[PDB]
Ligand binder design. Structure first.
Ligand SMILES: [Zn+2]
Ligand SMILES: [Zn+2]
Ligand SMILES: [Zn+2]
Ligand SMILES: [Zn+2]
Lengths: 217, 219
């Protein structure tokens, strides 16, 4: 089934990609599109090239210019559309580490990267922060100061889940600390968006800390 | 990155087998069946999710000196039937309901060599009791009751407490699902444990949870 895009705040839309697993059912993956006058910014590509093309059409059919994407770690559900965005001359961004992990895997790389633990896109529309290893070594989060939404990506676990999920690339013993570094920013969080599953409140941070500590033991 | 079949004992003469698929950008998803033993005779309730995992389950059994007498698949979906072709190639009897068999045929998938026509059927001389309670997860889903161990294999018609919804409903009859679960209840089996098609083994409470979720999606 195709990409779904639904409004979750003024100028903020959740995009969800799906894969249909024979014998199991549909699984899904979230990112955001953030709108500012006539400019759009994508936080995580959709999960496939085809879905990324649908996301671009969504924006441009509405008269927006897609200014940039940012991918919040190197896995395919965050980065599948980088190649397409690059082919359309849309700036793609990741952290330096994420870029280097993609390059090391022989995957298309973003055309731009940032070196520090913090970076901003869209002149403060989106504030990126690397809190430490968790779901992966390179996972970053995005804070949207206007809408008070934290896109936690795959580092955070929605309440629908009673486990950490895939941990093949995880640093389980650092994960709780990395969430605590997010808490220490004292963002006035109204909503937290996960990489997989339903939008929640700031309590998703506590839920994740607890899943992390349990797994550590 | 294939993670192999896992087999774990859950009662005397009853083993849970779990197959896994590793979905890039997501992680591992899984699917359960059973192996039920009677002396050195083994019966498979649902095949593993792939040919290779079915091979591994066959090797599990034969390495332990068991003869695999038959498999029974509890509906037509791939997670229940993937191994039918391979079992057939080794002359191991494969069973489904008549409806499941015909759905497979219609889809041009490998068909079982055996099928039962009634709403009830037994394998192994009272070892496994099969019952069709009605449509739910699919039009053809059946359940298996194990008298000796007091285990109900509910397969994908039942929802573990871990799940907040009915799951995939592309092939479902949401309106009939609660009723079908009530039909199971009406059997008055002395259930000690209920095993789902996807997720953790639980207690007879799984049935009430499923009725709840069915009613809610209906409403
Ligand atoms: Zn990931
Ligand atoms: Zn993810
Ligand atoms: Zn099914
Ligand atoms: Zn199933």
């Amino acid at each position: 089934k195709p990409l779904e895009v639904i409004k979750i705040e003024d100028g903020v839309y959740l995009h969800t990609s799906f894969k249909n697993i024979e014998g199991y059912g549909l699984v899904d993956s979230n990112g955001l599109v953030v709108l500012d006058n006539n400019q759009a910014y994508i936080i995580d590509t959709p999960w496939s090239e085809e879905d990324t093309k649908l996301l671009l059409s969504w924006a441009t059919d509405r008269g927006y210019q897609v200014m940039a994407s940012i991918s919040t770690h190197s896995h395919e559900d965050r980065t599948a559309g980088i190649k397409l965005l690059n082919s359309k001359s849309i700036p793609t961004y990741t952290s330096e580490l994420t870029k280097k992990l993609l390059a090391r895997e022989g995957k298309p790389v973003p055309t731009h990267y940032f070196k520090d633990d913090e970076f901003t896109l869209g002149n403060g529309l989106i504030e990126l922060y690397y809190p430490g290893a968790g779901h992966t070594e390179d996972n970053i989060v995005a804070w949207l100061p206007k809408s008070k939404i934290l896109f936690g990506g795959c580092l955070v676990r929605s309440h629908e889940w009673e486990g950490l999920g895939y941990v093949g690339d995880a640093s389980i013993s650092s994960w709780a600390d990395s969430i605590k570094n997010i808490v220490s920013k004292k963002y006035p969080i109204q909503m937290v968006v996960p990489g997989h599953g339903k939008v929640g409140s700031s309590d998703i941070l506590d839920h994740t800390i607890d899943l992390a500590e349990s797994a550590s033991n």
